[PDB]
Design a binder for this molecule. Structure first.
Ligand code: ANP
Ligand code: ANP
Ligand code: ANP
Ligand code: ANP
Ligand code: ANP
Ligand code: ANP
Ligand code: CA
Ligand code: CA
Ligand code: CA
Ligand code: MG
Ligand code: MG
Ligand code: MG
Ligand code: MG
Ligand code: MG
Ligand code: MG
Lengths: 259, 236, 260, 266, 252, 260
């Protein structure tokens, strides 16, 4: 199906939200006047054939879940692809964590449990659809609105391996460093988010990429510097260095901590 | 040109067939993204007698028609077999149904009511003429009410023998052709019947019968433009 | 009082003339600030035959009429030339069309349906009579439907302003003698009711004199279109020649007819 | 685990206007005091119950579960001591009959237009038959338009409750076998057939001065096709004959009707 | 079953329970979606097995709370009830707790305007004057029990969480409350404590124990006329403490 | 054009948002529509110039139609006051975004500031072409439409101070002190805002008005983690000589907007 015109005739590109590989834009649809977000994928950097990319995006679009970002339409011209998505208005999960440490307080186990409930439900769903996110972190989790009880929405599903420092590895499972990419790395990254939400600290910090990865590979994270036992138990489960013994998304949901 | 990942059925839910023309269907549709109601005129490329370039350029200009009394064309899509014109929904519907209504109910339409409808029609005509477009096929069934309200605006649809000017039979199709057709519409709206059935028999006010003679003047060259028609005293 | 920096044109976009009376014209408008549709009654102050203070007073009372069956007036503006009454818009249209359409289809309006209309009408009357307003010109052309649904509520429009056949078919006998009281509205409503249920006006003639004298002395035909005895009773009550003995709107509402 | 609202229906709903008095109880235009969204409520008196109230709730729950663009949406059902209140969406169209009568006045509804209504109708029937529901009372007065647009979709209302609660118009649409108390999903096909006939001809296929006259005509008489179906295509008449087949066993299902050539023609 | 209106189905047929917002002393609080409208609501579940009083008094007390129709009180639409629970269905607030704006201010380093706190106190005192004329004592006025309707800087407030603790089973407690004297004046005291907190960023009677705060509350940069109102509202004897309508008439 | 009642007949005054030298600001509900608005009340008695000049400056402000300028719907007037009726912004002042960043010790990215500056300079280009000098640009006179991170900005509070009757001095161009007021002073103020947004500091601080003036007139700001191109634009926008200071349209063409 071809459209008579270009993206500019379909959308008013209002502002650049970011860039990677390709820009992210706040957008208005010309026909309905409805606000959207467009992620532009420059097909230039495609170091893998577009057939495996067209398919991988096709399945991300099929992801229908209240805590996964909604993609409406995917458009393509000669140079680049345009992923048209719903707009989130409540900012990144990172802002809620940063505002917590700045205000000199903590996030409740109850509030965090509820947030993890939405997150793991999303992970359970897209893992069923055989998707691995590969880049889960607070800046890739958005609030739909600005209310305290705003639901969560996972964005920026990882496609980087198909386009080829210290801060990047902070959420990376130890096995990923050996190029073993499995859905179980999502569980690890989710667990790091959880640790971060509950303590205000990251479990494996460092001045370099190597420090982070060696620390995450061999050291158990500090638990002392104020969590409940059932919270720690689930964390110790989600942060098991060995992917084989790390639980799936469905089994995390069945933990005592969500009670 | 821009490619979409999927088909016309991936963008639209086709609800009901409103009609079938000589070169395609007209459907009530729902846009899946927004849940918004549109109508799609499907054009069968098979029935094209002229290279696609000419038919494509003719449509793109129509898409550009932005006037409160012309149908809004939102977007146009294409596959191997069809073109798809996505337009706004009118809930009125046909102006014909207003004539047929008064026709059966005895009384005729107010001169003041018809004056307002002609004003909208001519304002629309003057606009698309300045954009270098001839409609070719104006008739009460190609004019829709936007809603079910008694005071609803009209919207001209279906841009392309009872409404045909004498010039058109000799292949002389020009911007004046629409004026004749509109003059025939105005006659039908005021009298209750068509002017040339099978020179016209005429009751109406003096200032009104003067306009019908002007608009339905048999020579295209002497026929007034829509812009000058709107300057007539019958509107005042 | 307040002044606006501009004109009614800076404030409203006049879309279409809906009609034209003796006092002025009626327009479908759009408010520039909201894009919201209104209808404006323009009143040419030239045609005032009474001091303009009394006209401002009546219109002010009309604006305060807040009821689900009386047209809502939002604001009144005025030029050196005109008064501008800013009203909500009905998608309607007139009640007359509902009657006319029934004659064409040959299908008489059910009492159950007319009961509901009369219930809304009489409620509106009970309310605006409560506020010392006499409409003076009730008839099917002056009652609009809010929307196009079979069950649309009604809105009474065009409260009378005679301070600046046809209407005569709905006129109370005592109005011809220049006795205007809230009772004349009850009469008009009765004529509406009769018209609704029978598809006929009760007092018909070829002259204004013929109509007036029939209204004053003739008893209407109650057997045309079979009416229930309770409907007939109420009609007779509402169409009683003597205003002093004609019931109030509040009283009409308590009739046994509105129980079926 | 019975749930109760603290108050009465009157605390929950303002009753604005009586729409009418149905075969089982009144119908009202209604406003929710909370929202305050418009609804219509059907009030059925439990006095009239012919079966245990537990069983009526079960059968009403099945009707509530019916989710289709051409089936009236029931939001909630409440009860007090005397009444059951069915809370449903408001249609603004209103009755299919009104459109038939208007065509009879103007001179009749075109085959193309009626083809689209029947599509929506039979789709709805295929759906609710698959949910094991028999309507039993299909007729133009029991089919509503959502709005007054020429192209408004329809909504089937007033599903029959005759076996739950204790007319002359319904007789005109009633299949031969239901007179003999054999009531299956095929009786809805007949009724839809009678509606189709009426939409296309402006005439009912079977008329009489008495109930018995109507019954026997429906049972044995072939409709006056030659006189009444003059403007109709042969494939339309073929489908009418199929839907108005006397023996229900040979009558087609809603699914099969939907495969008829008439729908594929125009 | 107390002659209430019967619903065909359960609370799950009416509502999608989306998110748990908190766990109270005798029930939960949920973010909820009404199935029929798709409208968002908040439900307070009350566990009936936790009551220490006949269920009639509970229903009657919630009844008048439901009758509270004011721009600065939380709107209750309906109350439902099964065998185990009551479900208080209320409107959704989206701006968070008043406590947030106080915690956020002291962290940034600045203090809130007199003008801002006055307008907020005006909305609050208007709400009290209203529900006092309806013979309701809140009993638990505090920054976490006052929400902003929306997230705008000029958002109105809604009072939530009217006290009900006594029917079941210190910083804002009036002195007479420690001695079982529960009166509408105690809301006035609480309101005064919130105001002091809004204007200073400190709680007027701060301690680390009940007996520590109870004794200090019993005997212990803001403009003069602001302190004048604070002193009136924080009068130890409820008899000499002004009403809500009286506080409104203050020059501040 | 005259309105029937008074200002309280068409607006409900909900909340007082602030107070100025020549009036107040209120959050308001419109009675007809129920729509939220903001009303700026101008006290007429506090005027220093003829009333006609104020009427006229306000008129052209209302003509300002731009996605990044506060929309004025209408202006009303009684004997005591003028009433500017505006759209509502929900996102708070821009100053709050800067104050919040200093509290988190973090810095507003150049990419975020570039977009913000793009919108602002676009608004400046527009209203400068309409012969309007704002005269009082600063982060408290820039509001966010909504509370979302990516909310557009709306400039409010176009200066009128010299038509009536230090911290505004912090954004005041050197030539404004010498009573030379042109569109160039807006560029300076826009530069000061950009400086504030990028560094978390104001370029010229003073314990008194005299210190701020002299610093702004003769002293260079401390430019030392900004990119060379940011410093280049700041230096240009903060050029002492207005003659050599770039226009808003010129500023839009700068390289800094291209890279971020
Ligand atoms: N659907 C959306 N709705 C609202 N905001 C969004 C949406 N998607 C992304 N954003 C925001 O826009 C983003 C801009 O930067 P970002 O998305 O990090 O760049 P990127 O293209 O992911 N490259 P990198 O930084 O290498 O990951 C973040 O600020 C998101 O919060
Ligand atoms: N934009 C629109 N909104 C609503 N209805 C429309 C629109 N465009 C067309 N229609 C309706 O759909 C049409 C059906 O097809 P159309 O061909 O236009 O009519 P027709 O009587 O079939 N004439 P033809 O097909 O040329 O013989 C008419 O019923 C119109 O009223
Ligand atoms: N609020 C309204 N909404 C929609 N239509 C309206 C409204 N008020 C009036 N109208 C219509 O406009 C009217 C035109 O005037 P009409 O009443 O026909 O002539 P008149 O009564 O003799 N004198 P006047 O109406 O005062 O000009 C009728 O068409 C009404 O149906
Ligand atoms: N969901 C709905 N929305 C709108 N209207 C409805 C709805 N359900 C029913 N109605 C209307 O209310 C019905 C009233 O039932 P009906 O059996 O006609 O009562 P009645 O007054 O006895 N009429 P009749 O039987 O002709 O004498 C019909 O008029 C429907 O058009
Ligand atoms: N109407 C409402 N809209 C939005 N949020 C609400 C509403 N009512 C309550 N909340 C939030 O839900 C609450 C969670 O429960 P909370 O009020 O903290 O405990 P509680 O149930 O009152 N008992 P306690 O723990 O003793 O305070 C707080 O987060 C409120 O901000
Ligand atoms: N259109 C608007 N929408 C939302 N808030 C607004 C709007 N206009 C002004 N405000 C707010 O109201 C203001 C309070 O008054 P303020 O703007 O300080 O008065 P002023 O006219 O600037 N006089 P001064 O501050 O003494 O120079 C600020 O808090 C703004 O954030
Ligand atoms: Ca689209
Ligand atoms: Ca207004
Ligand atoms: Ca409800
Ligand atoms: Mg990202
Ligand atoms: Mg056509
Ligand atoms: Mg009139
Ligand atoms: Mg029925
Ligand atoms: Mg609480
Ligand atoms: Mg200011």
């Amino acid at each position: 199906l071809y459209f008579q015109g270009t993206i500019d005739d379909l959308f008013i590109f209002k502002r650049k939200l970011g860039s990677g590989f390709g820009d992210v834009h706040l957008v208005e649809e010309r026909s309905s006047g409805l606000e959207r977000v467009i992620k532009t994928i420059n097909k230039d950097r495609s170091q893998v054939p577009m057939e495996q990319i067209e398919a991988e995006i096709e399945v991300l679009k099929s992801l229908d879940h209240p805590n996964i970002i909604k993609i409406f339409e995917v458009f393509e011209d000669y140079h680049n692809m345009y992923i048209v998505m719903e707009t989130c208005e409540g900012g990144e999960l990172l802002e809620r964590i940063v505002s917590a440490q700045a205000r000199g307080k903590a996030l409740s186990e109850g509030y965090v449990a509820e947030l993890m409930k939405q997150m793991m439900n999303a992970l359970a769903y897209f893992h069923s659809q055989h998707v691995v996110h590969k880049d889960l972190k607070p800046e890739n989790i958005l609030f739909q609105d600005t209310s305290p009880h705003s639901p969560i929405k996972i964005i920026d599903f990882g496609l980087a391996e198909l386009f080829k420092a210290a801060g990047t590895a902070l959420y990376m499972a130890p096995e990923v460093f050996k190029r073993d990419v499995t859905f179980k790395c999502d569980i690890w990254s989710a667990g790091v988010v959880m640790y971060f939400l509950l303590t205000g600290c990251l479990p494996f910090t460092g001045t370099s990429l190597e420090e982070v990865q060696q620390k995450a590979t061999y050291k158990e994270p500090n638990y002392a510097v104020p969590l409940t036992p059932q919270a720690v138990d689930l964390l110790k489960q989600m942060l098991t260095k060995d992917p084989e013994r790390r639980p799936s998304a469905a089994q995390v949901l069945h933990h005592e901590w969500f009670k």
